[model samples]
Target: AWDLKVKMLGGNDFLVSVTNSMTVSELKKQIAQKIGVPAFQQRLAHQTAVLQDGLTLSSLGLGPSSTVMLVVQNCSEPLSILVRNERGHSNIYEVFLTQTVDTLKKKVSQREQVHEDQFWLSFEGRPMEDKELLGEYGLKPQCTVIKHLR
Candidate 1:
């Protein structure tokens, strides 16, 4: 077990040893209580991914003081997009600027039902690469997305 530096409700940092072999749900419960958050209301995010249930700490790659952030889900948000393939068929997906180009490709690959290498993305005539963030694309709150083959 190693110390995990946790900050809940975006407040002061608290350090504690994270227990092993616990589901993410179990871990969230423990931290929620310490931070006075109702068990069901807690949302723990780390790196860029929201943590999920039934995961062991070892799989999490958590070491001394991994900053686990608590995000309060915004109960009121409705934004969607119509992503089209080269064949011109479309499907709806929620787009967030905080997500990256690589993430977009993965989702597009899934929802659009295609392979990753076959997928390429572009914003405003520029090819969006995997390493790039989506915030720079400056897309409208609602729009169409298409695959730009490389």
Candidate 2:
């Protein structure tokens, strides 16, 4: 077993003891325990390539004291996301992970004093489905999301 340095982008760092035979997914679970983030929410990368599940550390050429980059995609806590209108206006909205797109739309309408059908929301140029949950988009707290309203 060897110690690998796990560094979170713009966040804390940690050291995890790993064996060459350990899979990347297994490592994620361990890292989750150390950091309190869910394994599925953790994206681990070594150098330029993102690690995949079922691939052993030895297969990926990770050596002792190797370092990996971690990015947390989602969390259970409430987060604020930026919503932009077609008129170049934007605002910040707070939401929880379990909130659906429809729920958010309602909140936005109430905050802006507009009817729900007056505008639509999209993310990254893709139209967001009302039935979809925000967490499904891999959006975490402090992340900037571009939404267009028309």
Candidate 3:
């Protein structure tokens, strides 16, 4: 059987393996699901360029009997920014810059000792959604994220 090995780009240096006869699209979808990344938003590549879903491994020069090495990398970089917590009650904090919103939320929850379900995030007057990137909203150079007690 063919072997497919995938590695995360920046955040997590993890390697995943898959053995199947599925096409490139199927592989990408499965990988996205496994990594908690939205299928459309996830990008997969080999050595040089990114692979399209419509193209199969064989079509991209990978034979059915061959092994493919896939490198998964994030398109953007996370800045070393600050996370400010403002809820008006009794919880407030300033988090480090190198942390992501998701990571920041977890940290805030732990520091304040609150459940994750009782926390929400907002950046530059807009609410933060799960798996959303800070670069998407055009915020840069030290964007501020607020985590409120829900």
Candidate 4:
């Protein structure tokens, strides 16, 4: 594979024989056609790492493998988010980037009894959006989440 070519140059190789625009499910279908593993049942990996359906091929930097081995999706090291609540107590979670901001806020609501819309959140000062993936915000592995109550 390209790993061999890269070895000559001191670089490396990665990911699917797919495009950046294709969804994880789409790549799975393409794989299934060549190997007969259905989209849901197949898990593609670069090596030991598992891939998730929420992300695209190009996003992870994968493409064109000489030998494809099925590898299950893997979890990242648990993320720590400290919810610095303005009310009284601080809350924390063992979270993942794939987890939604809405989901995290939902937990916050339950813990602080603060309505989802009643407060605003920021990661290192950037406002956190409810619709985007938690990991997309470029948060540190362990960071304080500012929960501004208004």
Using lDDT as the measure, which candidate wins? Answer: 2
Which residue pairs clash within candidate 1?
none
Would you give me the overall lDDT of model 2?
Answer: 0.79
lDDT (10s digit) by residue, model 4, range 1-150: 222101111343234355656766676666656554345445666445666777876576665433334643335676787887766466777777677788888988888887898987888778988966676566666678889878
User: How well is each residue in 48-136 modelled by candidate 3, as lDDT tens digits?
Assistant: 66777776565676544433344533445445445566644434344333334566567667887778788887766778765544443
- In terms of lDDT, the poorest run of 10 residues in model 3 is 90-99
Query: Which residue runs of candidate 1 sit more than 4 Å off their true CA positions?
Result: 1-78
Writing each residue's lDDT as its tens digit, candidate 1 over 11-35 gives 8778655676766767766775566
- lDDT tens digits, residue span 48-123, model 2: 7999978999999998858899988765568888877666667888988667888988888887777887777776
Error of 1 at 68 (Å): 33
Model 3 reaches what TM-score against the true structure? Answer: 0.37
Q: Which ten residues in a row have the lowest lDDT in candidate 1?
A: 72-81
Which regions in candidate 4 have their CA more than 4 angstroms from the true location? 1-74, 87-89
In candidate 4, position 58 carries an lDDT of: 59
TM-score of each: 0.45, 0.50, 0.37, 0.48
Model 3 stretches astray by more than 4 angstroms: 1-78, 87-100
Evaluate residue 114 in candidate 1 and report its C-alpha lDDT on the 0 to 100 scale: 74
User: Predictions ranked by lDDT, top down?
Assistant: 2, 1, 4, 3
